[PDB]
Design a protein around this ligand. Structure first.
Ligand SMILES: *[C@@H]1O[C@H](CO)[C@@H](O[C@@H]2O[C@H](CO)[C@@H](O)[C@H](O)[C@H]2NC(C)=O)[C@H](O)[C@H]1NC(C)=O
Ligand code: NAG
Lengths: 222, 185, 212, 201
């Protein structure tokens, strides 16, 4: 029932505006307040602000009014505006619930999180190259196939296997920052070698900032 | 789990407030009045079907006081967090003009078990005709309380439950009005 | 601004064991402290609020406590799901300030990595670049050494790796070392190999391909 | 003639140092009884608290006191050493839980109170108010022209009044149209037959 979900642009150029919305369901924005928290990649958590049930707002002084938090009770969604975006702002933005209009009401339910990257670089679709199983007898009955997602910007990328059906024994690796400044990652599955001629292994890559959705089949070459 | 019968006691310092009450699925069976030293059935009928010696409940509060000193010392006098209350105001039956009704003030999810509650008809304190429950125990081990005010609805009367608690900066005013009955829900 | 400093930074313990985090406040937060849990996928679930008030869907093994300005989360009977990142949070006055965190790791028995190696794809070769990938699957501990020898020659750069989180089921890590060359620099050799050094391996395991 | 029986609160173990708009200090004790399949399986749970933190707890399923925070270890160790003390706490499943169950079964378990059902529109959505019933096991259904509507029902949940009665509001998110006949159906153990209340445009 009680749910909060963030939604906003994946890629915002610097010196522009960042507008994120926290659509909530399960409770009324006329009795609960909504906080804003961001988490830079690898670093800790930073509190941004909060608009309470009765509309009173408290911002973090460090943010130098670059913050504008508004609310629309009837449409049950909270808003967030960041101005004068610098490279430091690249992080993951959350929202959380709190009762009443006083700081001593602890927050409880959190959102899923949304990624926002502030860079002048353009969005680029990923290139999906297949990692063939090949090998020989590949140990005693195993097999390793996988997909390689190379040269994309920015994050994130979501990799399913067999349209989600195959999940057991899957490792999708965290991205790395290539020398060019783009990202690159891979996803692998460990499947029985006997099933290499009697099961189809496709990987589905979704890169929302470039609307790139590629479905590449990984067929052995032996 | 079908039913649960809880015997709940607590003791608070320096206020020296004690409580001894029974619970059945969230509602109070009876509590022992510390002032008059008698059992107080939440619904009066109960007393016709059962009894309880209230002097035995006092001995339990004595041990509670003892244990509280032990605990307080064994924690280097670590205080309690003033956990603010959660307050909504609703009516017993759907409001109909000129029909007897009751305004209920639901105070929930707070601790310490100390609160000032005052009804306000049109901005003025309501003196007589108010009932109130003892502090009811929650399962997250905070507290919950009920304050009642029977009334006769009209369009010329606004009400407010004024709750003061140490977790708050200012008193909490929850406003009720005939035009806006179910709005909060 | 109040300062929140969490003590155990990278604690690592075993299953069915008791751990304890310490969060200490520069000023007095007067009991307004919450404990948060962040599984690696981003999910943030609240465990304890107001120093030691247990949230609804939290087992009784989780336990908050306070002595002075010292706040302690104590997870008893450590179970598999209880291994994630943990933050502490003050909310006595704006601004709200978080602790630094605490990576909690499930220590298990040693596991040797099964080492696989992947040739570059035909699609990638045409594009003028080439990437060879070496995968070390289901190993423990996280500490492992991977080395690229091209034609029996140790390569230094163009070697970028990536480790996963601890698997929720089998509690092992996985590593992906990717060596990148140009289509020109690729066709200039024949033997590409991958040398893996780990605790569970008696001696380095080397898988290799000869472009054929 | 029926007498409730109290559960003795046990003294802690003397074992601590010292130190120091006024700070408050709270100690709670909850002797709770849990009943399953009527009176067949009974779990007793002699719990001791400090503020909102559980310190030490006896479990009838465990048979001895076990600490819930490290500060409760002295107390759990002190109490389990007393041989006679543990026997009473183990027999409490019968001595105290079952005894107090039978004392109040008439007015607690077997307590039935008719609801009062009321239908009105507000906000144009339709509300089915069901007030003053015990117990809380209740099912409310919305029918739209003799066709149950399992889509659009936002129930406010069970709302405890505090006077051993519950209330609840089930709202149906439907355009009232015209000539249509909406019906609210209430099933409750205090009734002999499912109540229905109609409302026409
Ligand atoms: C209940 O009301 C009393 C009286 O207003 C409050 O006691 C006062 O507390 C202030 C500090 O908050 C003191 O300066 C006054 O001297 C106190 N007056 C008396 C008569 O004691 C009390 O704080 C209120 N309780 C709650 C929980 O709000
Ligand atoms: C409940 O108790 C009765 C005895 O009164 C027994 O026959 C029945 O099997 C029990 N049911 C369950 C689910 O334990």
């Amino acid at each position: 029932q009680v749910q909060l979900k963030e939604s906003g642009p994946g890629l915002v150029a610097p010196s522009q505006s960042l507008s994120i919305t926290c659509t909530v369901s399960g409770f009324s924005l006329t009795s609960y307040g909504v906080h804003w928290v961001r988490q830079p990649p690898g670093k800790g958590l930073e509190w941004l602000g909060v608009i309470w049930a009765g509309g009173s707002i408290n911002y973090n002084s460090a943010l130098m009014s670059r913050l504008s938090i508004s609310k629309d009770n009837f449409k049950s969604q909270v808003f967030l505006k960041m101005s004068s975006l610098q490279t430091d702002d690249t992080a993951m933005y959350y929202c959380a619930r709190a009762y009443g209009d006083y700081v001593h009401y602890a927050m409880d339910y959190w959102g899923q999180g949304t990624s926002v990257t502030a860079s002048s670089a353009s969005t680029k679709g990923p290139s999906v190259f297949p990692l063939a199983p090949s090998s020989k007898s590949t140990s005693g009955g195993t097999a390793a196939l996988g997909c390689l997602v190379k040269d994309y910007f920015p994050e994130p990328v979501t990799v399913s296997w067999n349209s989600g059906a195959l999940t057991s024994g899957v490792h999708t690796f965290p991205a790395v920052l290539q020398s060019s400044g783009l990202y690159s990652l891979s996803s692998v599955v460990t499947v029985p070698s006997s099933s290499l001629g009697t099961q189809t292994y496709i990987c589905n890559v979704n890169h929302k900032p470039s609307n790139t959705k590629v479905d590449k089949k990984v067929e052995p070459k032996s | 789990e079908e039913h649960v019968i809880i015997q709940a006691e607590f003791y608070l310092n320096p206020d020296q407030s004690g409580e001894f009450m029974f619970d059945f699925d969230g509602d109070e069976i009876f509590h022992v009045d510390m002032a008059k030293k008698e059992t107080v059935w939440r619904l009066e009928e109960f007393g016709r079907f059962a009894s309880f010696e209230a002097q035995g409940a006092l001995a339990n509060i004595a041990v509670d006081k003892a244990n509280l000193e032990i605990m307080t010392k064994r924690s280097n006098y670590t205080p309690i967090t003033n956990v603010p209350p959660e307050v909504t105001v609703l009516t017993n039956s759907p409001v109909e003009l000129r029909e007897p009704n009751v305004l209920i003030c639901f105070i929930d999810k707070f601790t310490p078990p100390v609160v000032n509650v005052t009804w306000l008809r049109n901005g003025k304190p309501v003196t007589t005709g108010v009932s109130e429950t003892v502090f009811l125990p929650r399962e997250d081990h905070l507290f919950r309380k009920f304050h009642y005010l029977p009334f006769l609805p009209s369009t010329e009367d606004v009400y407010d439950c004024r709750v003061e608690h140490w977790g708050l900066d200012e008193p909490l005013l929850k406003h009720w009005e005939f035009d806006t009955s179910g709005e909060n829900l | 601004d109040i300062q929140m400093t969490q003590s155990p930074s990278s604690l690592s313990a075993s299953l069915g064991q008791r751990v304890s985090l310490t969060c200490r406040a520069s000023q007095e937060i007067s009991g307004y402290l919450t404990w948060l849990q962040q599984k690696p996928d981003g999910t943030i679930k609240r465990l304890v609020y107001a120093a030691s008030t247990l949230d609804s869907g939290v087992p009784k093994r989780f336990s908050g406590s306070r002595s002075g300005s010292d706040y302690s989360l104590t997870i008893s009977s450590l179970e598999s799901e209880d291994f994630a990142d943990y933050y502490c949070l003050q909310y006595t006055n704006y601004p709200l300030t978080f602790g630094a965190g605490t990576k909690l790791e499930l220590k298990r028995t040693v596991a040797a990595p099964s080492v696989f190696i992947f040739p570059p794809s035909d699609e990638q070769l045409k594009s003028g670049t080439a990437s060879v990938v070496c995968l070390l699957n289901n190993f423990y501990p996280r500490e492992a050494k991977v080395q690229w020898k091209v034609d029996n020659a140790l390569q230094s750069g163009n070697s970028q790796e990536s480790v996963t989180e601890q698997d929720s089921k089998d509690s092992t890590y996985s590593l992906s070392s990717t060596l990148t060359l140009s289509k020109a620099d690729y066709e200039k050799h024949k033997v590409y190999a991958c040398e893996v050094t780990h605790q569970g391996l008696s001696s380095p395991v080397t898988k290799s391909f000869n472009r054929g | 003639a029926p007498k409730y029986v109290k559960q003795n609160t046990l003294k802690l173990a003397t074992s601590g140092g010292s130190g120091s708009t006024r700070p408050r200090f709270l100690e709670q004790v909850k002797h709770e009884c849990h009943f399953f399949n009527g009176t067949e399986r009974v779990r007793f749970l002699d719990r001791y608290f400090y503020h909102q933190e559980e310190y030490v707890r006896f479990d009838s399923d465990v048979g001895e006191y076990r600490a819930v925070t490290e500060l409760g270890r002295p107390d759990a160790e002190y109490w389990n050493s007393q041989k006679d003390l543990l026997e009473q706490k183990r027999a409490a499943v019968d001595t105290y839980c079952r005894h107090n169950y039978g004392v109040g079964e008439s007015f607690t378990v077997q307590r039935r109170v008719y609801p009062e059902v009321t239908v009105y529109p507000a906000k144009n959505l339709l509300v089915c108010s069901v007030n003053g019933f015990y117990p809380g096991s209740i099912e409310v259904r919305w029918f739209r022209n003799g066709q149950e509507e399992k889509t659009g029902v936002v129930s406010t949940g069970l709302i405890q009044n505090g006077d051993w009665t519950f209330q609840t509001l089930v709202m149906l998110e439907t355009v009232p149209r015209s000539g249509e006949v909406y019906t609210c159906q209430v099933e409750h153990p205090s009734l002999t037959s499912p109540l229905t209340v109609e409302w026409r445009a």
